[PDB]
């Protein structure tokens, strides 16, 4: 994903060497920037991605299947599937 | 939109003062490229857009009503609901 991507590595290496709520300060200050339901879906996600990584699994397990299922509502499964097909595989 | 405006003046420059077939002739090039139906719209509205700066209004009249009502299908209102609205304003 293209600034799934480009924020996605961003942060990940702004936090994985140095200190994790320093990204996650951001984080929503980037969030917060966002103004459409499109816009405020992904930072909620990489944010998962991001505790993910930190071995913090259950934490954001909910933040996963709670946006699992506040996305099958409004049919991006035929708009971008694999986007919600990999958090089928990581929920 | 990023991509979107990327590739808007990338296709609309090349042809406004270059050919405009030449642009259209690489246009499905970059839509067969297209791998999903969210990949395969953006080609086919920007394609509107071409034509309809070349004063062909009505030619692709038909092609916006046709994707005004081929997106109310899938929630696109509810994520994403400006790059419709657009489409609300040029049908």
Chains 1, 2 share one sequence.
Do not use: C
């Not at 990940?12 to 816009?39: T, W, Y």
């Not at 996600?45 to 509502?73: F, I």
């Amino acid at each position: 994903g293209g600034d799934w991507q480009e924020k996605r590595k961003e942060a990940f290496q702004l936090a994985k060497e140095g200190g994790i709520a320093v990204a996650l300060s951001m984080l929503n200050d980037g969030l917060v920037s966002a103004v459409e339901p499109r816009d405020k879906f992904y930072w909620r996600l990489l944010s998962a991605d991001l505790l993910r990584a930190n071995h913090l699994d259950a934490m954001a397990g909910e933040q996963y299947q709670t946006l699992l299922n506040q996305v099958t509502t409004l049919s991006v499964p035929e708009w971008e599937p694999s986007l919600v097909e990999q958090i089928q595989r990581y929920t």
